[PDB]
Scaffold this motif. Structure first.
Motif, mmCIF file in Angstrom:
data_model
loop_
_atom_site.group_PDB
_atom_site.id
_atom_site.type_symbol
_atom_site.label_atom_id
_atom_site.label_comp_id
_atom_site.label_asym_id
_atom_site.label_seq_id
_atom_site.Cartn_x
_atom_site.Cartn_y
_atom_site.Cartn_z
ATOM 1 N N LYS A 37 24.202 30.718 -35.977
ATOM 2 C CA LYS A 37 25.609 30.585 -35.550
ATOM 3 C C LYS A 37 26.440 31.877 -35.583
ATOM 4 O O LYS A 37 27.531 31.910 -35.008
ATOM 5 C CB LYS A 37 26.318 29.479 -36.351
ATOM 6 N N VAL A 38 25.946 32.920 -36.253
ATOM 7 C CA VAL A 38 26.598 34.238 -36.251
ATOM 8 C C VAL A 38 25.555 35.337 -36.027
ATOM 9 O O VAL A 38 24.806 35.684 -36.944
ATOM 10 C CB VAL A 38 27.369 34.502 -37.569
ATOM 11 N N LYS A 39 25.518 35.873 -34.807
ATOM 12 C CA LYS A 39 24.676 37.029 -34.487
ATOM 13 C C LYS A 39 25.325 38.308 -35.012
ATOM 14 O O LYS A 39 26.093 38.967 -34.304
ATOM 15 C CB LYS A 39 24.418 37.145 -32.975
ATOM 16 N N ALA A 40 25.038 38.621 -36.273
ATOM 17 C CA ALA A 40 25.413 39.912 -36.863
ATOM 18 C C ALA A 40 24.425 40.477 -37.902
ATOM 19 O O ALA A 40 24.754 41.463 -38.566
ATOM 20 C CB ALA A 40 26.810 39.809 -37.463
ATOM 21 N N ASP A 41 23.227 39.892 -38.023
ATOM 22 C CA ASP A 41 22.199 40.290 -39.016
ATOM 23 C C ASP A 41 22.650 40.243 -40.489
ATOM 24 O O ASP A 41 22.033 39.564 -41.310
ATOM 25 C CB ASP A 41 21.613 41.670 -38.677
ATOM 26 N N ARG A 42 23.685 41.015 -40.814
ATOM 27 C CA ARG A 42 24.399 40.932 -42.093
ATOM 28 C C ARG A 42 24.947 39.529 -42.369
ATOM 29 O O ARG A 42 24.633 38.923 -43.396
ATOM 30 C CB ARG A 42 25.551 41.946 -42.087
ATOM 31 N N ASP A 43 25.764 39.026 -41.444
ATOM 32 C CA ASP A 43 26.470 37.751 -41.620
ATOM 33 C C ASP A 43 25.557 36.551 -41.342
ATOM 34 O O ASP A 43 25.679 35.889 -40.307
ATOM 35 C CB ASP A 43 27.717 37.692 -40.718
#
Ligand SMILES: [Mg+2]
Ligand SMILES: [Mg+2]
Ligand SMILES: [Mg+2]
Ligand SMILES: [Mg+2]
Ligand SMILES: [Mg+2]
Ligand SMILES: [Mg+2]
Ligand SMILES: [Mg+2]
Ligand SMILES: [Mg+2]
Ligand SMILES: [Mg+2]
Ligand SMILES: [Mg+2]
Ligand SMILES: [Mg+2]
Ligand SMILES: [Mg+2]
Ligand SMILES: [Zn+2]
Ligand SMILES: [Zn+2]
Lengths: 127, 214, 100, 82
Positions: A37-43
Motif C-alpha cells: 500500500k506504500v511504494k517507498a521501500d522504507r515505509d
RNA sequence: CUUGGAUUUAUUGAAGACUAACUACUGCGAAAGCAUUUGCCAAGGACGUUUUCAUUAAUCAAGAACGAAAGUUAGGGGAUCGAAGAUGAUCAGAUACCGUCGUAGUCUUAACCAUAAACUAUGCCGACUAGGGAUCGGGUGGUGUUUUUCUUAUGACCCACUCGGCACCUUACGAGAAAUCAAAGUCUUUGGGUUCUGGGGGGAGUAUGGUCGCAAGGCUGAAACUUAAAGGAAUUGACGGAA
C-alpha cells in the motif's frame, strides 16, 4: 450470527502483514501487506502503511462476507527480534476502526525452546 | 485471469459432543470438480479454536483445542480433538522468577491405537508464612514429582479409550489428582495439562466416529 | 588499570565459565550474567488503542493479555538507550532495584 | 565474648550451642536410648544414631530406621534414655 | 528475490544441531567445564558417627592426568550466523564497518594439539584476630503453624543455634603507593610449613640450539646492541560523535 476469521498480523520490523483466514487456516481471505500500500521501500513497517493494509483487508472481508476476527500477532520470531513490530498495533487499531468485530486476541510469535544459532556472529552486528 | 472467489463453497465445522456446542463455525473450499474432489481435500483440516468458544464460560479461556476434520457428511464436517493447547500468553504469565517449574511429558497408547503425548506443567508454591523469597524444591523432590505425574498419566490415559480421556482433561480432574499426589512431596501451584499431542492412528473407524455424534 | 568492580560479570563467581546468551538488538554473544535482563511485560494492545479494541469487540471483560519478553542486552548496546545509566564511583555499589 | 571472657567456666547454654568438638573438652551428645519393642519384654540399649536396621535381640521386629543423624524409632515404639 | 503466488497460510517428512523460559551476587566439578527426559554406570564433597587403622601427614624439581575455543588429519552433516570471498553504498579514497549473500567450519564423531584477559590478573596447607544478616547443603531443638485420613506420621515452612561453599558497613588500631583489603591483616615489634615465579625498559618470547609435534605451533630460551625513562596508582585540569 457472527461469521468469523483469524486476522494474523505478521508484524516484523521492516514490514507488516494482515492475513485474514478461515478457522482451519487453509482458505485465506486477504493477505494485505505494508509494502503493498506504500511504494517507498522504507515505509513498509511504517504505521500509516500498516493501517492502510488493514483497511484494505477489512474491505476485502466485507466484500467476501465476514463479520468478526480473532487477532493473532506474529513477531518475526526465532532467529530474529521476538518483538512485535511498529505497525502491528497500528494495524489492530485500523481494524477496530473499520468495525470488523474482534474476539480472542493472541500473540503466537514462535518463541523457541533454545534457538538454532542467531544473527551477527559472536561479536554481533557492529554499526 | 481466473478469480476463484466466486468459484467457492462454504461449509460448517462440526465439533464433537464432549463440549457444549457440536458446531464451531464456518470454513470453505472449492467445488468437487472432476479429477480433484472436495471431500478428500477436506478430510485432514485442523481447526484450532478456543475452549471458552466451545464451553461458553471464561474459566476455559485459558485453553485451545486443535480439531482435525475426519468425515465429511452432508456439507457439515465432523472433527476430532487432534490436539489440546495453551496459548503462549497463558503459561508465560505463570512462569515467574523465584519459584521452580515442573514439566512432565508422557507417551501413552490408549485402548485404541492412538499414541497420545500428554504434558503436565506444575509450579512450586510460595507457602503461607514464607520469608525465603525463593520457593525452590530440591532436584530430587522435583524428579519424584515428575515421576508421580508420569504414573498418573499412565493410569488415566491408556485407560478409557481416548474419548473419555479428553472429557476428563476438560475440567482439570487429572490436574487435581496430580496435585493431590504431590502434596506429600511439595505443595505446588497451578498444575495443568498445557498440551495434548498425538502420533499414530488406525483406519478411520467411521462407525465409532459417528457414535460420538448423536 | 584497576578493577572497576568486584563482581564484573557478576553471577559468575564459583562458576567456572557458564553458558552464554545472544543479545536482542545486536545479536552479540554475551555471558548470561554480564547480560542486563530487563523483563518487557507489555500489554498486547496499545494504550490508546485499547479503547478502540473494546469498542470493536465481542464479549465482556476480555482476555486483554500481556506479551512477555525477557530481553537480554549486550552491555554496550544496553548503555546505548536501555537500563544501564552510567553512575558515579560511589553510586556503583548500590544494587537495589531503581525507582519504586 | 569481649576482653574478659573468663574462659574456664562458660555458661552451659553456650556449650550446648557450640559444636560437639568446639567446647572446652570433647564430649558427645549422642545417647544410648534403652528401647523396648511392642513384642517381647526385653530392653535393647539402642545407640540413638544407629547406622543399622536395628533388629531386636533375636526377633525380626525392626526398632529404629537409621536416618543420617538420629534414628527414627519405627512405628509406635517406647524408649528410656541412656 | 519472485510471481509460471516466491513470501504468506496449513499439515507433514528428512537430516544433523542445539538444548530457552526456568536462571538468582543460585548449585556442582581438580580446572577446562557442566542446565529438557528418564534410565543405567561408577565416583565425589558436606554432613552425621561413643565406628576402625595409628603418623599413613603438608607442599613439591623428575615426571603424570586433564585441558575452552579455533586449527589440524580423518568421518558425518551443514539451518542460520559466518575468517575466506563475492558485492552495494559512503568518503579525497575504504578489498573497512553498515549492507546483501556465504566454501571452512561453527555442531557433532575418531585423532591430535596443549595454548588463553584458562583472570579472583589474588599458589597451596595451617593457625589466630570485628560486627551483620541473609543465602545453598547437612543436623539439632522448639505442646510453633498448616496439611487432615480423627491423634496423626512424612512433607513444608517459622524461629534459634549448629557446622558448610560460588556473597555487605564502619573504623581500622592491622595493610596498603593508592584504588582498596576482614584479608591483600598478625612484617624494620622483620622467622607457622612449602612449591613456584620476578629483578629498569626495549631488543625478544626473537636468534640459536635442544626437545615436542602431521602441521600451525608448544615447551625451553640468549646475547650483541640500544635507551632515561617504561610503568603503576591516583589529583587537578583539558577533552569525548559518553549520560
Ligand atoms: Mg579504563
Ligand atoms: Mg598491564
Ligand atoms: Mg566450588
Ligand atoms: Mg575459568
Ligand atoms: Mg540449583
Ligand atoms: Mg530447559
Ligand atoms: Mg612438572
Ligand atoms: Mg574444535
Ligand atoms: Mg558479513
Ligand atoms: Mg564496494
Ligand atoms: Mg630486562
Ligand atoms: Mg594510569
Ligand atoms: Zn546488543
Ligand atoms: Zn525377641
Amino acid at each position: 450470527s457472527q461469521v468469523f476469521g483469524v486476522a494474523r498480523i505478521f508484524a516484523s520490523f521492516n514490514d507488516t502483514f494482515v492475513h485474514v483466514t478461515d478457522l482451519s487456516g487453509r482458505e485465506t481471505i486477504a493477505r494485505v501487506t505494508g509494502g503493498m500500500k506504500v511504494k517507498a521501500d522504507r515505509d513498509e513497517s511504517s504505521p500509516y502503511a500498516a493501517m492502510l493494509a488493514a483497511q484494505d483487508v477489512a474491505a476485502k472481508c466485507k466484500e467476501v462476507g465476514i463479520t468478526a476476527v480473532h487477532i493473532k500477532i506474529r513477531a518475526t520470531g526465532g532467529t530474529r527480534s521476538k518483538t512485535p513490530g511498529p505497525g502491528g498495533q497500528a494495524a489492530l487499531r485500523a481494524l477496530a476502526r473499520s468495525g470488523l468485530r474482534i474476539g480472542r486476541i493472541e500473540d503466537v510469535t514462535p518463541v523457541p525452546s533454545d534457538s538454532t544459532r542467531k544473527k551477527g556472529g559472536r561479536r554481533g552486528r557492529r554499526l | 485471469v481466473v478469480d476463484p472467489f466466486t468459484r467457492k463453497e462454504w461449509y460448517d465445522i462440526k465439533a464433537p459432543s464432549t463440549f457444549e456446542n457440536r458446531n464451531v463455525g464456518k470454513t470453505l473450499v472449492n467445488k468437487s470438480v472432476g479429477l480433484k474432489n472436495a471431500s478428500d481435500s477436506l478430510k485432514g483440516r485442523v481447526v484450532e479454536v478456543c475452549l471458552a468458544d466451545l464451553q461458553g464460560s471464561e474459566d476455559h479461556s485459558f485453553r485451545k483445542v486443535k480439531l482435525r476434520v475426519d468425515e465429511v457428511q452432508g456439507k457439515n464436517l465432523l472433527t476430532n480433538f487432534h490436539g489440546m493447547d495453551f496459548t503462549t500468553d497463558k503459561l508465560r504469565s505463570m512462569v515467574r522468577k523465584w519459584q521452580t517449574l515442573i514439566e512432565a511429558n508422557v507417551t501413552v497408547k490408549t485402548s485404541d491405537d492412538y499414541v497420545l503425548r500428554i504434558f503436565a506443567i506444575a509450579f512450586t508454591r510460595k507457602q503461607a508464612n514464607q520469608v525465603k523469597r525463593t520457593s525452590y524444591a530440591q532436584s530430587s523432590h522435583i524428579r519424584q514429582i515428575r515421576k508421580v505425574i508420569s504414573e498418573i498419566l499412565t493410569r488415566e490415559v491408556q485407560n478409557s479409550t481416548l474419548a473419555q480421556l479428553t472429557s476428563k482433561l476438560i475440567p482439570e480432574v487429572i490436574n487435581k489428582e496430580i496435585e493431590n499426589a504431590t502434596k506429600d512431596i511439595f505443595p505446588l501451584q497451578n498444575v495443568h495439562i498445557r498440551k495434548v499431542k498425538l502420533l499414530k492412528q488406525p483406519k478411520f473407524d467411521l462407525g465409532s466416529l459417528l457414535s460420538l455424534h448423536g | 588499570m584497576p578493577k572497576k568492580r568486584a563482581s564484573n560479570g557478576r553471577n559468575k563467581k564459583g562458576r567456572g565459565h557458564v553458558k552464554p546468551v545472544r543479545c536482542v538488538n545486536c545479536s552479540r554473544s554475551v555471558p548470561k550474567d554480564k547480560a542486563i535482563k530487563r523483563m518487557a511485560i507489555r500489554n498486547i494492545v496499545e494504550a490508546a488503542a485499547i479503547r478502540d479494541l473494546s469498542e470493536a469487540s465481542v464479549y465482556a471483560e476480555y482476555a486483554l493479555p500481556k506479551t512477555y519478553n525477557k530481553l537480554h542486552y549486550c552491555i554496550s548496546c544496553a548503555i546505548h538507550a536501555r537500563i544501564v545509566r552510567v553512575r558515579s564511583r560511589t553510586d556503583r555499589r548500590i544494587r537495589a532495584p531503581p525507582q519504586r | 565474648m569481649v576482653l574478659v571472657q573468663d574462659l574456664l567456666h562458660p555458661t552451659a547454654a553456650s556449650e550446648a550451642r557450640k559444636h560437639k568438638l568446639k567446647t572446652l573438652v570433647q564430649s558427645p551428645r549422642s545417647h544410648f536410648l534403652d528401647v523396648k519393642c511392642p513384642g517381647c519384654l526385653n530392653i535393647t540399649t539402642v545407640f540413638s544414631h544407629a547406622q543399622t536396621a536395628v533388629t531386636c535381640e533375636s526377633c525380626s521386629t525392626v526398632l529404629c530406621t537409621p536416618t543420617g543423624g538420629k534414628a527414627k524409632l519405627s512405628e509406635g515404639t517406647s524408649f528410656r534414655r541412656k
